[model samples]
Target: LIVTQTMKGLDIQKVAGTWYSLAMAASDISLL
Candidate 1:
């Protein structure tokens, strides 16, 4: 089984732009 999760974070003090992913994982979720 494979799983994948993605998360996006932003720098509120600087701007509304997204900095990058905070947490990402690949495992059993991909199987579905």
Candidate 2:
């Protein structure tokens, strides 16, 4: 279990939008 096995090189992904992660998306579900 060691982390000396990563990183060759990478690029960053930038975006101009919105993303929603509904982890608990319910207030009883009918009240949405």
Q: Which structure among the candidates has the greatest lDDT?
A: 1
lDDT of each: 0.55, 0.44
lDDT string for model 1 (1-32, tens) is: 66666547744465467655456665443533
Q: Which stretches of candidate 2 lie over 4 Å from their true place?
A: 1-4, 15-32
Candidate 2: residue pairs that collide:
none
Local lDDT at 4 for model 2? 40
Query: What's model 2's lDDT at 5?
Result: 38
Lowest lDDT sum, 10 consecutive residues, model 2, at: 19-28
